[PDB]
Symmetry: none
Subunit: 583 residues, 2 copies
Amino acid sequence: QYEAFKDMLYSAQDQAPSVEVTDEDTVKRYFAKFEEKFFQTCEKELAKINTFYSEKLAEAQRRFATLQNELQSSLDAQKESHEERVQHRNIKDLKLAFSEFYLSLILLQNYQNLNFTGFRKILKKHDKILETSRGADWRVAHVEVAPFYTCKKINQLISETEAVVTNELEDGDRQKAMKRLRVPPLGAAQPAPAWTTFRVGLFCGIFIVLNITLVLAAVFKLETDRSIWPLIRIYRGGFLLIEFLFLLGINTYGWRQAGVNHVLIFELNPRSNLSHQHLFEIAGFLGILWCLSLLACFFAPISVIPTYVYPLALYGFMVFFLINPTKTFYYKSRFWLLKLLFRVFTAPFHKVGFADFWLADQLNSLSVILMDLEYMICFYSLELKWDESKGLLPNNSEESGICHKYTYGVRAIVQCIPAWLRFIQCLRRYRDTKRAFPHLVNAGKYSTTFFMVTFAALYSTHKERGHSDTMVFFYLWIVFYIISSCYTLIWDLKMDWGLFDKNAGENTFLREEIVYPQKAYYYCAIIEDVILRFAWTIQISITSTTLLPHSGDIIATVFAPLEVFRRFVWNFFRLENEHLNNC
Amino acid sequence: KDMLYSAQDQAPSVEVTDEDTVKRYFAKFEEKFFQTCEKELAKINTFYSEKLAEAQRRFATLQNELQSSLDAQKESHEERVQHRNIKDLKLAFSEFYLSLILLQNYQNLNFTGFRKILKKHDKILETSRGADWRVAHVEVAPFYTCKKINQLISETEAVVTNELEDGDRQKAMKRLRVPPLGAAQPAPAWTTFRVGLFCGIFIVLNITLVLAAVFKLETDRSIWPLIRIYRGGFLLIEFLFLLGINTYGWRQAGVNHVLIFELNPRSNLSHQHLFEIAGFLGILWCLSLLACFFAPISVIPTYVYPLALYGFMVFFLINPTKTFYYKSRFWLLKLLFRVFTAPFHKVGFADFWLADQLNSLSVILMDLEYMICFYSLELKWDESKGLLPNNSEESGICHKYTYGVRAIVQCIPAWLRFIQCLRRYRDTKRAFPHLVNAGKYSTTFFMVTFAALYSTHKERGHSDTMVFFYLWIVFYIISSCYTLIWDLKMDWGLFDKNAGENTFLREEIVYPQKAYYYCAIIEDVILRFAWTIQISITSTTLLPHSGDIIATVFAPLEVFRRFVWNFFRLENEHLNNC
């Protein structure tokens, strides 16, 4: 109430005239009016302070009752592998609750002290201006006799509860309890040693310069005599992967800006995790490797092996890095990732957790890399002859198009593997939980993909023979597209993010409680998602406006670094909503 | 991790004797560990008891002082005296409380470390007696559990604020706000990110530079003048990088260079910052060089690209604004101003150091002389036709010696050292060091004037030129070996006659390895007589266009000598004077 006191003092000073400016009676009347206004303001401030103190006392009592109930529940659970993990989670939750209670008590004490200091300052200012001694008396009767400052049993109770929790759970491990209940938590990273950040900067700088020299060489040195397009087909997918990692770096920083606890939801080791700088430096390493490989393929200084070793060497280096058995180069993280890939493929043996379907969904937007893997095998096995030079093969030959066409239609299965595995995983989820409300609908949502791809493949295979009745099949493909798109939209908005809920309140189109700073970010994310998820519609416009061959493959390449973005933005609010419920 | 590694490396024999001997050995090791842990616990308990006694004594003294102040108050100048006494008592109480809190925190940290070590030993040795003993005895210390000291201190502060400060609780709390102690000086992560960026771009640009030079470059064009220009900038960025390495070395060695330089207690700079500016300089130099040779854009001539860079140089220093390390540039500008006068200003250590550095940066003095030279009487500003893009004798009267414009620019830094040392002798009235420095720097003038007169006489054909040149060579050594005996005797303070247990070195040293010292000595001997190789190579038939190549390759080694000489010069004066 410092602002109100300052405004009242300014108004009183303005209402106070000079000695000779106004008459004695008028000056006395103005002084009486100012004193009455000051008394009314002081009474209002005292009432507000009393109400705030009562509310704070009620909140403290409620917090103490909740802490006691949680402690009793934890003691009952302790009295009466997976069990060890559950006990550790309960201990961590109790420690977090105790730390929150201590922080709330400290904040309440600091706020009470600040309010008392402000009241004393306002009383001093009123005494200086209006020459009245009532402010000091009010401050003495209120600030000095404040029950909140006098009540110090809260600190003793908090200390006793913390000691009891440490004795019962930590079994005398005071260091772990102090670390878990430490006042500082988020905020200061904590910064890594300077070598890691220096490596990140060096790697990103080399990546940038290599990109500039690559584009300059492509626009200047390259001769438009040979179709470089297949090269993109063997490189594009790799780019997506590295791009993905870059985003993931920033992604984790997001979870460090909102303060949402995300290490626990992944069941990761709290004393060993992967910071954003590590992901950034891995991204830099893979990026510089990719740039050097592509530049070497572009120039080929040595005219003995034109193309057959550069992409294969790059991908072999990548996989060897992935499954390196030595205890170096983030061995623990690589082993954990390989174990989770095993688990997501060996689903039926063990329970399904968060990270399982999280990684499954991430791969769902990464099917392009599977397409390019099938394409490299596709080019290398049937129609490319190893015994040649350079590889200047004109497209006029009839050998081309052999595995551009669907042939047996294997492309549908390789396209739909993520959908199939998500369908199976959701089915097992329903079998284990016996509850079908959020699962069979999810199964149908992933099942729409089967129909989408099979219709697209059948139309593409059958358009050449004729049978003008394919217009009906084209219409069915389109309507399946629309229904899949709206199903994905509604599932993402209502269920995945919890937005558009019937219980909105003052935060229109939002949930009751949010953690991200601004709402314009929410709205911009929504509009970006709703433009991106009908990307293919824009594609169809080209096929409705141009008859130029092979025009759809370039726009698809531009379309490729967009499904990684819509997952990047979706990965933000997914953990926010999932912070509420449990899997 | 010492227990985990040392114990595992023992590798006891599985089948060498009966299990009784192994059990006895394990029991003996456990008993020794228990005795060590008991001794450590007793020492920690004694330290904690001493800290608690000191804290109790400090609290009693503070309480007595507060009671005396309250009694005096209860009973103008008297009010001011009472306020000053209250402030002094509050400051003393705050200092005592901070010391007690630090002691308690140290004791708690020591106890936690001992408990962690015991737990690690128990886990490694697969035993439960040590952890149980630590939990029963070390973890049951009542001193750590007792936290009434903080509550009593807070209550005393509140009472003092209420009774003495008259409701100024916030001021008392701020004056007695001591709890989470601890501070350091960590470098910002963005600084390391920036230096990493600049280093990466700089190396990659050097690689593209060398590839372009070896591949696309053709012989017909004139390469020499361009490298004459670019040597100065290369030397500048090199010196900046070695200066950063030098200041990191001083900081790590613990030599208090900030006090001997009388800098502000912030140092006005950090080695990371030197690294960033050096990287930015290298980026500009590489971009400019690639622009000159590649020349991709329009019809802009190649003779303008360096100027902007060089302009940027002065633009970096004479920028009116308040950005780009505004404290360092102003300090360096004023120091470089006060160095270049000499008689007008007083002599300080920084001026002596800067003049010494400028002595070795000889090349960056006459490169600009050739610069203004071509841009005065060799340029083709207006048009671009057959206006002598080729080379002949007339264009290039300037890269030789000829007039004294080159000898004098070579001799400026020695002039500055001579005059500054004479000023020191004048205002100090000291004989030996300044007088011998006068000679050691007049040898420089003698060598340069002899070489200049030889060069200007050879072009005319006077017979005595074949004699005087013969003298030039000796006039070099009589200088050079003098300078050497100066760097080791007094400049570094080595080869002391009253040497002790340490061979060929002074008795007290700070750097770890003596091999560093020996390497420094031998490197100084090699690079101080570097000019012998120059005359050795040009002591025979003169290969066409092979004159100045030796200078370029020998240029960065001279600064590399300045790299090592700076380590001991600062240390020797720091150790002996301070």
